[PDB]
């Protein structure tokens, strides 16, 4: 019973830590995307709040030239793309490394170009997530993701502390158990 607990708890801890780290990274990417999209939508936002299609995501730096060329070569002169570096480089959602990133926003005309750009980004191994359509939605979902990010950080710290405590307890007597 003791060893079953000490193993099942550790395995559940590891699995939950992995999943929650993935979610935390995805949510922080979404937060950065929202912040930079708000920054881009700040030339002159006189109106408070549908043909144009909208997407946004994050790319690995130094892939901006190739990606821009590929877009301007596939969706020939009929799609718009804005890019902004993300200072304080971030950790990849799955690849698991600290790499510089650029948050980018793409505007397109219709469904065919929507599909074109979506598939192009998927091939370019970017990530998109949803995005707001009105400034009210932007503010709402940005606040939501920020709060969820803080909650996930707290839960991550607590679970890591739990793992550390249980592993210390295990190491206290592992030799005697062996």
């Amino acid at each position: 019973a003791n060893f079953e607990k000490i193993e099942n708890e550790l395995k559940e801890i590891n699995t939950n830590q992995e999943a929650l780290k993935r979610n935390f990274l995805e949510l922080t990417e979404l937060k950065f995307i929202l912040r930079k999209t708000q920054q881009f939508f700040d030339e002159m936002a006189d109106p408070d709040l549908l043909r144009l299609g909208f997407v946004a995501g994050v790319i690995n730096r130094e892939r901006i030239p190739t990606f821009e060329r590929m877009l301007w070569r596939v969706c020939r002169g009929n799609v718009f793309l804005r890019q902004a570096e993300i200072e304080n480089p971030l950790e990849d959602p799955v690849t698991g490394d600290y790499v510089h990133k650029s948050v980018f926003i793409i505007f397109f005309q219709g469904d065919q170009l929507k599909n074109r750009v979506k598939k192009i980004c998927e091939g370019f191994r970017a990530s998109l997530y949803p995005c707001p359509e009105t400034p009210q939605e932007r503010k709402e979902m940005a606040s939501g993701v920020n709060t969820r990010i803080d909650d996930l950080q707290m839960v991550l710290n607590q679970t890591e502390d739990h793992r550390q405590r249980v592993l210390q307890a295990a190491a206290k007597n592992i030799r005697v158990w062996f």
Binding site: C75, N78, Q109, G110, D111, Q112, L113, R116
Partner: protein, 163 residues
């Protein structure tokens, strides 16, 4: 022959682009023989369907090329007795295919300009599909007749027992 169609996006007027492309190029050197295409002003539509068409005419050019080359092969086979001057025998109009293309002019009767781009594409597609099916059927029947003749020749050939 190899012919290259180049967009030459106007440059604010027909002259500013076409003159430099053709006359200036020829004066600099006889690198290539220049010609004007004079495309008709079709009915441009929405960009969603326009990109759809940019894909459909990506596929259909290859399909129609295949059909035309199949027709050429069938002509080379059926007319194998007098296969000389296959290009001359195949020229759609004029003296030769080169002449026809260099003087190409869109046939409003063949395709209604006022129709939509997708409609014109479908008009071409139905005709080419019918052409391909008819080529397959008729060439197969003629080949079957020729094969019956060849079987008769084979029966005439060989030893008395084998024949």
């Amino acid at each position: 022959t190899e012919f290259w169609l180049i967009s030459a996006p106007g440059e604010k007027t027909c002259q500013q682009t076409w003159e430099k492309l053709h006359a200036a190029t020829t004066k600099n050197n006889n690198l290539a023989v220049s010609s004007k295409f004079n495309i008709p002003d079709l009915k441009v539509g929405t960009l969603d369907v326009l990109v759809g068409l940019s894909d459909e005419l990506a596929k259909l050019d290859a399909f129609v090329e295949g059909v035309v080359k199949k027709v050429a092969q069938y002509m080379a086979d059926v007319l194998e007795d007098s296969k000389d001057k296959v290009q001359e025998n195949l020229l759609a109009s004029g003296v030769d295919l080169v002449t026809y293309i260099t003087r190409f002019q869109w046939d409003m009767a063949k395709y209604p300009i006022k129709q939509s781009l997708k409609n014109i594409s479908e008009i071409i597609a139905k005709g080419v599909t019918q052409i391909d099916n008819d080529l397959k059927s008729r060439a197969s029947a003629y080949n079957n007749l020729k094969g019956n003749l060849q079987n008769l020749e084979r029966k005439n050939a060989g030893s008395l027992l084998t024949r």
